[PDB]
Amino acid sequence: TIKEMPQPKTFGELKNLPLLNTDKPVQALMKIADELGEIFKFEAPGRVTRYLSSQRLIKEACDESRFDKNLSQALKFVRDFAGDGLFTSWTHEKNWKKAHNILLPSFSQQAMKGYHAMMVDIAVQLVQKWERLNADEHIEVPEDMTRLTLDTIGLCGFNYRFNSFYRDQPHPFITSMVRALDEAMNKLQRANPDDPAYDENKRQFQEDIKVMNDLVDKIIADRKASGEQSDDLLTHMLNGKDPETGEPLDDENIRYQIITFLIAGHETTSGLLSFALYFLVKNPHVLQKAAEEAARVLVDPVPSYKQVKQLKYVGMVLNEALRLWPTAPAFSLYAKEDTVLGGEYPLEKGDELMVLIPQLHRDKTIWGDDVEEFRPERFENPSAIPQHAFKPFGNGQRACIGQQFACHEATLVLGMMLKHFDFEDHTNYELDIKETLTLKPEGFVVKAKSKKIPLGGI
Amino acid sequence: TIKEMPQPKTFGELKNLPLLNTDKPVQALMKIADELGEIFKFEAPGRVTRYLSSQRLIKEACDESRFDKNLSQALKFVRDFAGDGLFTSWTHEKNWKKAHNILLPSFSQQAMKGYHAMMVDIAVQLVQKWERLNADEHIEVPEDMTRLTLDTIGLCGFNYRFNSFYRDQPHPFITSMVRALDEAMNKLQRANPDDPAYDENKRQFQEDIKVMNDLVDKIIADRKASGEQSDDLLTHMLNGKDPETGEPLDDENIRYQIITFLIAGHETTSGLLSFALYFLVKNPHVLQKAAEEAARVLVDPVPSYKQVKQLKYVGMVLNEALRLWPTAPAFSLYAKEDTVLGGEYPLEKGDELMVLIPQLHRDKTIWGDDVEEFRPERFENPSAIPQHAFKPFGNGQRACIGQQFACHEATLVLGMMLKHFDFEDHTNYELDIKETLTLKPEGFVVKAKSKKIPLGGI
Ligand code: HEM
Ligand code: HEM
């Protein structure tokens, strides 16, 4: 029977909008979901969305016959620099299906065999950095993880070295990307967007868009001008034809794809690695199990592709980190036609839903009462997990195209870290989660004592 | 560096085979392992296996990239009546993966909420039996535990009442199941099984298979006709679809699954309860601690699901019984590819291993020197145990699908026993372990004096 959904506290004519005027909006929404349950309405001037937290409702939301990907206000703002790349395109735009069909084979599990050597190149740089620290020094974890994941997508994707391990201050492209992302996210919480105060932000936004476009357009133009057949994502985009339309991507869409991949590789996989290491140092029996596996499996001076596929327990660790802190924590959907959600909530065509992934992943009816505990063993027998219960990579045809890339990279790197070092939570670090496009453990530091195991050449 | 492995005494061209021509083969193999150490070769005419006893080697055997489940000769003979049910199927058989995907969510810890009431039905029957004994009487422990466990899987699994507490002699189906298993196990010694001497054995075997098939097929046929929904394992099997293939199980395979569950829920699961109660009566301070927990937690006339989940020390007692006398004490593996075990023992593709679980569980490098002592406190934090050190339910994707079911049932029943009765080892019983498919403390008897605490309705 039909039910009225709950709604969090309001602010007069601003409705719920000021609830997002916080540097930690997803975390605020999680606390609201804890108070209100599996569904709540969230209203702002001119817009309504419904936040879903239960597997029961989210499984219905994931029915692609009833619901399609929506661009949230955040993604609409990100679209000012990521364009109609795969992440910020509507499913019905021609460039979505074109790019999807062209790029899917380049992101497959099979494709990882070809990226593996370049992934190892950057992972060796990380391990060497940490081998070279002095006794009294420590590691800035999200910082080094971001250096690694950005450089890996730059190299594997476009044969471009950001050389982030040679820098304190980020590459200029990244300065502009990060500042562009910050502006996109800050705009969400402004009650008066056109206020004269925000004039200067808008000028900086246009300058950062120009830095990004200029470097990426030059990368593309340089590759076209050289003729080089590097066999990377850029080569595949320049030469590939969509089997369905027979058309290639144009150079402007290629730029948007490249921007999109650099955003992804800076923002998400780095957070996964950071959270994984956080949980490992907070759960030393789990760390022991992962380290024992790394030692047993990674028998050669550098890891092979086959060896990375052998690291089951490291995979379980990564999935359990994705469970607790999925680093792209929300995705949006719209109702394709009028429909009733969960037998109880009537929706009209066009109505928006938000899937709160960290809450889905804390659904006690699925996972049990111990949802805050870090237990990789939850994933030991993967078929035990119900359908649509675990969605850190989104849903259906609009799921993360980078999933195999992220998993392979993270498994490789975490395996190598655990083979080469013991870790100490020397500050007894208190988890503090910063929110940008994604989630990361801000200020997370550790000490790493080398096991003094030689590392092979690249 | 490459070692030759030890081998127990041989009998000319019969090799090691006569060592298993004994009433207690697992216990013989344990003694061989004490003599020979972590690995030994066992040869019979036409075959070889290697028995493993250390965590150091078993952790490698449990690497699913390197080794998969093998059907031992015993499981090949059980397959004559358990078919391609989950326990007697190869991982590469379509019906293994289909049934695995369909059934696993119905055996989860969360699924136990739905079975709990039916489990209580049978547990109340056990408690009422014991409340109704006269002062001069005693309890035949494995016999009553088997009545409980069989009836619980019958009721929870397919809404069938064996009514074992209304009988002295087994239900006709069970007579046939036990005699089929006996025949399967006896066939392990027979040199020329096509000898006319065994014609009656073959006739009896076919008759026993017919008894089991007729009942189970009728159960299935009766349910399909009615359209009755019971939320039980049969309902799930009739309606469920494998997410991967999109196919349901066929009726023949469902029958094999039901036969398989009945085998499992008989003495394999009742052995846990029997050994647990044995160890409790032999360790009165442990019994007292467990009884104190039961009294503190089980404050209502019948136990709730949540209350059973609070019986931590009862669960520790059960784990410690599984440590010493795991009731499915060995499992078989085969090498997927050529590989070296432990840096020392080269194996070829197809080579077989046997994991001797009771010996694994006595590895002093893992458990310390006191491995024969019954100390439930070893399990205060099960996360402290290394990977592949405590394996009473097997390994990985071929682990026991019934683990949560068995543990929940055993915790519930043992908690109620400890709430309702004091126990006396009135005969000072000498442990005598009978071997079939499983292990049982044969002849174990106790007296139970009622605490005279009322029991609720079902
Ligand atoms: C742990 C790491 C990652 C996580 C958790 C993650 C998560 C997600 C999620 C949840 C979506 C769906 C978004 C929505 O529905 O609005 C998505 C889409 C996407 N991700 Fe990722 N991602 C990760 C890594 C990557 C990487 C490494 C790349 C590329 C190199 C990438 C590229 C994309 C793209 C292109 C899409 C859009 C796909 C489409 O709609 O066609 N991601 N990701
Ligand atoms: C204390 C009780 C039990 C113990 C110690 C036990 C132990 C085991 C072990 C060691 C295996 C792996 C066998 C191998 O690798 O060859 C296994 C498999 C299995 N067990 Fe159990 N079990 C118990 C209770 C149950 C119950 C109650 C059920 C069902 C009602 C069940 C159903 C199964 C099934 C279907 C498999 C095959 C799983 C697969 O390969 O997909 N077991 N059990």
Q: DSSP class of residue B265?
A: I
Number of domains observed in the structure of chain A: 1
Report whether A361 contacts A35 (CB < 8 A).
no
Domain limits at B237?
Answer: 1-458
SS3 of residue A354 by DSSP: strand
Compute the distance from residue A400 Cα to the ligand 1 centre, in Å. 4
Distance CA B308, CA B52 (A): 35
Burial A42-68 (b: 16+ CB within 10 A, else e): bebeeeebbbbbbbbbbbbbbeeebbb
Compute and round to an integer the Cα radius of gyration of chain A: 22
The SS3 of residue B72 is coil
Told to judge if A407 belongs to the known catalytic residues of this protein, a careful annotator would answer: no
Beta strand pairing call for B352-356 and B47-52:
parallel
Kindly name the residue from A107, A400, A411, A444 that is annotated as catalytic: A400
A138-159 CB burial, b ≥16 within 10 A, e <16:
ebebbbbbbbbbbbbbbbbbbb
Assign residue B325 the CATH number of its domain.
1.10.630.10
A310 touches chain B (CB under 8 A): yes
Nearest to B421 by CA among B449, B440, B443, B453: B449
Question: What are the start-end ranges of the H helices in A283-383?
Answer: 284-297, 305-308, 312-324, 357-360, 364-367
Nearest CB partner across the interface for B383, out of A285, A365, A380: A285
**What is the C-alpha to C-alpha distance for residues A107 and A84, in angstroms, rounded to an integer?**
19
| Interface list for B 236-265 with A (CB within 8 A) | 243
- β-partners of residue A43 are A48
Nearest to B315 by CA among B433, B454, B447, B418: B418
- Contact between B294 and B127 under an 8 Å Cβ cutoff? The reply is no
Task: Give dist(CA B437, CA B350) in Å, integer.
Answer: 24
Residue of A296, A368, A381 with shortest CB distance to B399: A381
A269 C-beta closer than 6 A to ligand 1: yes
Which residues pair with residue B39 across a beta bridge?
B52
Angstrom distance (rounded) from CA A402 to CA A390: 17
Nearest to B78 by CA among B355, B438, B440, B397: B438
Q: How determined?
A: X-ray
Both tokens assigned to B107:
């055996």
Tally: H helices and E strands in chain A: 16, 12
- Token pair belonging to B20: 């298993």
List the one residue out of A197, A248, A209, A268 whose CA is nearest residue A83.
Answer: A209
Q: Coil, strand, or helix at residue A82? A: helix
Please identify every residue of B annotated as catalytic: 268, 393, 400
The rounded distance, in Å, linking the Cα atoms of B188 and B44 is 11
Let me know: does A262 contact A220? Beta carbons within 8 Å. Answer: no
Question: Is B400 known as a binding-site position?
Answer: yes
Starting from the CA of residue A256, give the closest ligand: 1
